[PDB]
Amino acid sequence: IETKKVVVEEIASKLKESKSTIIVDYRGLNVSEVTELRKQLREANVEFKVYKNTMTRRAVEQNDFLTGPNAIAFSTPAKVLNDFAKNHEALEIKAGVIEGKVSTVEEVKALAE
């Protein structure tokens, strides 16, 4: 209970600390491809984590894209992300944000460019 409270707290913390973040689906891919992504972002020093939609929303307001499966990628990145996406092509790259400015799909693609 308070555990979930702490969780949403640190999520909002790392959120407000970052100034680039991306919001994607994790569905239709094996743990091997997942950990491939994880390793290439480990060497990229780009954080990547997995949370629930409800607590995620609570952290944001502490929007429409927040439903469904949702993992997140902090860069305090989009390059490696879109490269992985072009590779595998079973994903959603649904949203992003930068300096708190909500970034469109095309905009995160442009940062990937």
């Binding site: 950990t35 994880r38 390793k39 480990r42 060497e43």
Partner: protein, 132 residues
């Protein structure tokens, strides 16, 4: 398909012959190809993957030896514990832990040397080894 095969020994038939007789490819030419690549410590049980496309386009990949193999070469022993945590019978050195870590860093998931070491330490627990 995985195969645990010593390097210089290729075509010791009875394990490996069946491993590809279902595939129906040339067992022995493939075996001597495997030796040709694995001109290595004969007895080093290489994990070799093989992938055959339906038209008999076979391609195979040698890989790092197992943790148990490297640790038994380190301790110079034949077998792990028959009852680890009731009878530890083997031991090797933290330097060797570093060595095997740095060896098999390319294959593992753990980007961390120390986390790979923890993985090998769990292996050592499983096979009855202590560390020094």
């Amino acid at each position: 398909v995985k195969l645990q095969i010593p390097a210089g020994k290729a075509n010791p038939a009875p394990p490996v012959g069946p491993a590809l007789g279902q595939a129906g490819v040339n067992i022995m030419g493939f075996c001597k190809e495997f030796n040709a690549r694995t001109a290595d410590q004969a007895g080093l049980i290489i994990p070799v993957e093989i992938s055959v496309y339906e038209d008999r386009s076979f391609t195979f990949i040698t890989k790092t030896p197992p943790a148990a193999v490297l640790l038994k070469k380190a301790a110079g022993i034949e077998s792990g514990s028959g009852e680890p945590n009731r009878n530890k019978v083997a031991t090797v050195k933290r330097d060797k832990v570093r060595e095997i870590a740095e060896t098999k860093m390319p294959d593992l998931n753990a980007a961390d040397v120390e986390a790979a070491m923890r993985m090998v330490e769990g292996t050592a627990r499983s096979m009855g080894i202590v560390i020094e």
